[PDB]
Amino acid sequence: KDVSEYSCRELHYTRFLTDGPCRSAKPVTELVCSGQCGPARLLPNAIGRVKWWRPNGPDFRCIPDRYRAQRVQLLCPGGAAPRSRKVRLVASCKCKR
C-alpha cells in the first residue's frame, strides 16, 4: 500500500453514529486520511492589500476514495429510543492533492 508513502498511514478510528439526543457505540473501524501531498508553493494575490487570505501555505491532504459500510443503531440513556444509522468509513483512500 502506497498509503503510508506520504501520510494517513494505516490509521484506524472509532466513530459510529450520533443523532437526536442519542448516540451509537457499536465497534467501527475508519481511517483518518489527513496529511500532506501537495506543493508548498505560495501564491501572492494580495492585489496590494492582504487581509482575506494569506501565503500561509496551500491546503493539501489525503483524499478519501472508498468507504466501508457500517450499520449500527444509536443508543440512548436507558436504551428506550434506539435508532438505526448508516455510516460510510473510508476503508481505503489515497494521498492526493
Curated annotation (Swiss-Prot):
The gene is Sost. Belongs to the sclerostin family. Residues 10-97 form the CTCK domain. This is Sclerostin. It is found in: Secreted, Extracellular space, Extracellular matrix. Disruption phenotype: Mice were resistant to mechanical unloading-induced bone loss. It comes from the Eukaryota. Interacts with LRP4 (via the extracellular domain); the interaction facilitates the inhibition of Wnt signaling. Interacts with LRP5 (via the first two YWTD-EGF repeat domains); the interaction inhibits Wnt-mediated signaling. Interacts with LRP6. Negative regulator of bone growth that acts through inhibition of Wnt signaling and bone formation. Disulfide bonds join C8-C62, C22-C76, C33-C93, C37-C95.
